Structure 1
Amino acid sequence: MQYKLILNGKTLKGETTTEAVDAATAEKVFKQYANDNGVDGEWTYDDATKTFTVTE
C-alpha cells in the first residue's frame, strides 16, 4: 500500500512516500512523468524493499 520513489538526477537526489492501491499504474504514470520532467536513470522493482531507485 506504500511505496518509495528515489530518483537521483546525477546531481539531484530526492525521496518521497505515497500510499496507493495500484503501484503498477502509479509506477508507470510516474515513470513517464519523471522522464518528461527530465528524470532519467535505471529503474527497477524491489519487492524486498518495496522501494524504487533511479540513477542518471
Structure 2
Amino acid sequence: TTYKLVINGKTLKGETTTEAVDAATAEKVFKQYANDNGVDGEWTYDDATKTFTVTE
C-alpha cells in the first residue's frame, strides 16, 4: 500500500500520497488529481520506489 505522485508540471511543482490496493488504483487516483489541477503530461512508475511521475 501507499503510492506517492511527483508533479513536475508547468507552474506546479510538488508531491502527494495515496492509500491504495494495487498500483493501478493509484494511477487512477493520482491521475485524477492531475486533471483536477490542470497538469497534463507523461507518466512513469518505479516499484523500487512505488512512485509516479507527471512531466508536463
Normalised to the residue count of structure 2, the TM-score between the two structures is 0.68
- Gap change, CA 1:17 and 1:25, over 3 Å in 2: closer
**Structural RMSD (CA):** 1.9
- Gap change, CA 1:15 and 1:32, over 3 Å in 2: closer
Task: Render the CA deviation track for 1:8-53: whole Å, top value 9, x for unaligned.
Answer: 2222111112222132123124324413531112201211121111
Aligned residues: 54
- Structure 1 residues without counterparts, runs of 5 or longer: none
Identity of aligned residues (%): 96
- Structure 2 residues without counterparts, runs of 5 or longer: none
Cα distance in structure 1, aligned partners of 2:33 and 2:19: 18
